[PDB]
Write an enzyme that holds these catalytic residues in place. Structure first.
Site, mmCIF file in Angstrom:
data_model
loop_
_atom_site.group_PDB
_atom_site.id
_atom_site.type_symbol
_atom_site.label_atom_id
_atom_site.label_comp_id
_atom_site.label_asym_id
_atom_site.label_seq_id
_atom_site.Cartn_x
_atom_site.Cartn_y
_atom_site.Cartn_z
ATOM 1 N N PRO A 1 0.812 -1.214 0.000
ATOM 2 C CA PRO A 1 0.000 0.000 0.000
ATOM 3 C C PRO A 1 0.855 1.278 0.000
ATOM 4 C CG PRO A 1 -0.176 -1.254 2.075
ATOM 5 C CD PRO A 1 0.358 -2.159 1.034
ATOM 6 N N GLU A 2 0.313 2.350 -0.571
ATOM 7 C CA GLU A 2 0.974 3.652 -0.586
ATOM 8 C C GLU A 2 0.720 4.399 0.715
ATOM 9 O OE1 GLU A 2 2.736 2.863 -4.173
ATOM 10 O OE2 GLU A 2 3.290 4.232 -2.559
ATOM 11 N N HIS B 1 -0.955 -17.318 3.064
ATOM 12 C CA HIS B 1 0.203 -16.421 3.088
ATOM 13 C C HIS B 1 0.291 -15.577 4.357
ATOM 14 C CE1 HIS B 1 -1.044 -17.050 -1.196
ATOM 15 N NE2 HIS B 1 0.155 -17.605 -1.178
ATOM 16 N N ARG C 1 3.818 -11.848 -1.449
ATOM 17 C CA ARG C 1 5.156 -11.632 -1.985
ATOM 18 C C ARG C 1 6.257 -11.906 -0.954
ATOM 19 N NH1 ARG C 1 4.453 -11.993 -7.109
ATOM 20 N NH2 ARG C 1 2.489 -11.028 -6.428
#
Ligand SMILES: [Zn+2]
Length: 251
Positions: free
Chosen positions: A1-2, A92, A111
């Site tokens: 997220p930004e 995950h 990721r």
DNA sequence: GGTAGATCCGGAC
DNA sequence: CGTCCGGATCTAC
């Protein structure tokens, strides 16, 4: 997220965990833990601490406990969730903090790219990864004067400068492209080539873009018409990143 | 001491 | 389907 999404996470996560005491810490991918180097030590030190607050610096979340700060970076795909210890974990899930009330703070990352560092609260601001972080883009400490000083002392592109976390904290690739577009500046321009008027216009658009999102013209829009002039947006590599610009609007 | 390159990661070409 | 790609180290010219 930004950064704007991290601010939203900070705001919404805090009431869900404030005042909860850690009873266990389960780690399924040890490499996420960067300090202490041993994940068994990371887990053991958190146990018995109560969550007192949650702050943000750049894209880092700083969980404030009794003696420790946990500093967390989600990168692109990390997510936090608070849920019951009785329910199955989502896929995950790499780190879980179990609270004495039967709830859990869960860290999930497809990721496996995020990081966690734990230090005594007083040490946190002077050790990685917070140590050399630049000013908040929305703070008075990030002024056009601070930006001009960094730009004039480098040989790098203006895009490379804004990507540098020591210049300004947590200003992502998306916001750099959007701010440069709004400011009318090419991303490959040497930072030292920017006029005084360009610097202040750039600061202004940086503040506007990030400020608007916390309260798209180019990014991912390559081959599509510019919303202001109808010129196809181009995509290139600048500072090793996907870089999006209008070659007419930006100079 | 500024800075490019190396490093981590897996889903998507 | 080897290669591509984000952020922020850390490494080493
Ligand atoms: Zn345009």
């Amino acid at each position: 997220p930004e950064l704007p999404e991290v601010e939203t996470i900070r705001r919404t996560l805090l009431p869900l965990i404030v005042g909860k005491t850690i009873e266990d810490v389960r780690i399924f991918w040890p490499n996420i833990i960067r300090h202490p180097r041993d994940s068994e030590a990371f887990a053991a030190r958190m146990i018995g601490q109560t969550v007192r607050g949650l702050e943000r610096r750049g894209k880092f979340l700083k969980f404030l406990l009794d003696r420790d700060a946990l500093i967390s970076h989600l990168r692109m795909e990390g997510r936090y969730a608070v849920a019951s210890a009785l329910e199955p974990l989502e896929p995950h899930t790499h780190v879980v903090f179990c609270f004495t009330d039967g709830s859990e703070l869960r860290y999930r990352d497809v990721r496996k790219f995020g990081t966690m560092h734990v230090y005594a609260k007083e040490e946190a601001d002077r050790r990685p990864p917070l140590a050399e972080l630049g000013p908040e883009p929305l703070s008075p400490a990030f002024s056009p004067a601070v930006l001009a000083e960094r730009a004039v002392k480098t040989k790098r592109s203006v895009k490379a400068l804004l990507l540098d976390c020591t210049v300004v904290a947590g200003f992502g690739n998306i916001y750099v492209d959007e701010s440069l577009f709004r400011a009318g500046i090419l991303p490959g321009r040497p930072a030292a080539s920017l006029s005084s008027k360009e610097i202040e216009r750039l600061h202004e658009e940086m503040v506007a873009t990030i400020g608007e999102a916390v309260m798209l013209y180019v990014y991912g829009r390559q081959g599509n018409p510019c919303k202001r002039c109808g010129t196809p947006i181009e995509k290139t590599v600048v500072a090793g990143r996907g870089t999006h610009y209008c070659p007419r609007c930006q100079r």
